[PDB]
Amino acid sequence: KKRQWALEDFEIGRPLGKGKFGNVYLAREKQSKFILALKVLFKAQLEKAGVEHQLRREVEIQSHLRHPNILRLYGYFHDATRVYLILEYAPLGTVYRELQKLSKFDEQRTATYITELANALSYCHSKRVIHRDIKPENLLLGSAGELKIADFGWSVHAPCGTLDYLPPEMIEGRMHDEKVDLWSLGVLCYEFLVGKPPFEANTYQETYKRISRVEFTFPDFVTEGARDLISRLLKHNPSQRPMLREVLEHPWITANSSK
Ligand SMILES: COCCOc1ccc2cc1OCC(=O)N(C)CCCNCc1c[nH]c3ncnc(c13)N2
Numbered sequence: 001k002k003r004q005w006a007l008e009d010f011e012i013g014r015p016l017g018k019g020k021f022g023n024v025y026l027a028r029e030k031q032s033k034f035i036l037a038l039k040v041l042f043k044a045q046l047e048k049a050g051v052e053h054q055l056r057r058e059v060e061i062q063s064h065l066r067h068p069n070i071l072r073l074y075g076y077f078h079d080a081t082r083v084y085l086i087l088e089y090a091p092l093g094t095v096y097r098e099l100q101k102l103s104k105f106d107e108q109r110t111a112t113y114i115t116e117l118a119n120a121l122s123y124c125h126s127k128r129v130i131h132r133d134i135k136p137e138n139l140l141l142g143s144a145g146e147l148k149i150a151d152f153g154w155s156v157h158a159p160c161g162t163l164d165y166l167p168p169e170m171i172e173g174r175m176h177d178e179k180v181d182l183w184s185l186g187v188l189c190y191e192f193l194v195g196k197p198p199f200e201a202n203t204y205q206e207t208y209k210r211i212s213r214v215e216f217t218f219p220d221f222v223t224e225g226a227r228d229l230i231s232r233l234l235k236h237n238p239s240q241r242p243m244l245r246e247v248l249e250h251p252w253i254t255a256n257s258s259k
Helices: 043-049 052-063 095-102 107-125 179-194 204-213 224-233 244-249 251-256
Strands: 010-018 023-029 035-042 073-078 082-087 139-141 147-149
Touching: 010 035, 035 043, 043 052, 043 082, 052 073, 095 139, 107 147, 107 179, 107 224, 107 244, 107 251, 179 224, 179 244, 224 244, 224 251, 244 251
Parallel strands: none
Antiparallel strands: 010 023, 023 035, 035 082, 073 082, 139 147
8 A cells, every 4th residue: 555544644524333343434635635535444343243353354355356346445544442443435335225215126226236336346247246234224325326336345254144145055154256246146136226235034934944955035016027037046056146247237237228
């Protein structure tokens, strides 16, 4: 990097969101006036949870990712008690909150989100990078409503968390592959259109069985092109899922996506 960062370089503004390990704040770099987000994580929490060194890896990965639909990490630093991530600010907030406000997305908004996700994942696959738990809460909106993936690139542990967004291979304790991200598109496409993710339940263990079985239904208003895309992405067998190019070339995506 070009700079040594300290907290005194930044004027902190209001909280943008509150996470398990800490909060995200609006901030402004004092000398340049550059507005950004600062995500502040407590070291003690990271340690106790056993994710401290995992974060380090994901930050290094993230620091090398440049793409209009991937939230930019500009730098990072620390002090005795906290880690600080210096991020691109996404002024229209999370897709989660947009989904709550609208209850569900129309086909053009969904198709365009899926296209933008798929471009970002395709850029990440060209670097051998994958994701885990891509969820509306981790997807952000830029100044012109463009999707930004905030969820860092995933890095594994040595060889309780929510199951909604995980593919069969992750949960059955099996080998995994970039094709996890194809499963993620399927889950997200469904959730964008329907308003809830497709394997939801009141219990984790029930959600587990639903995913393993790929057991889900479509409400009557979900159209055939959409049912086609979602069903090809939610294949139990990773090899039967399409490639990212096939998602971008799918007639329902091309009929509804903004070009
Ligand atoms: C290990 O860390 C990986 C990076 O993860 C994140 C980077 C940036 C994020 C959120 C990230 O994770 C999710 C999280 O911590 N939440 C509290 C969810 C709230 C979303 N924030 C709302 C928000 C609004 N405008 C923003 N501009 C930039 N970043 C933002 C936000 N938040």
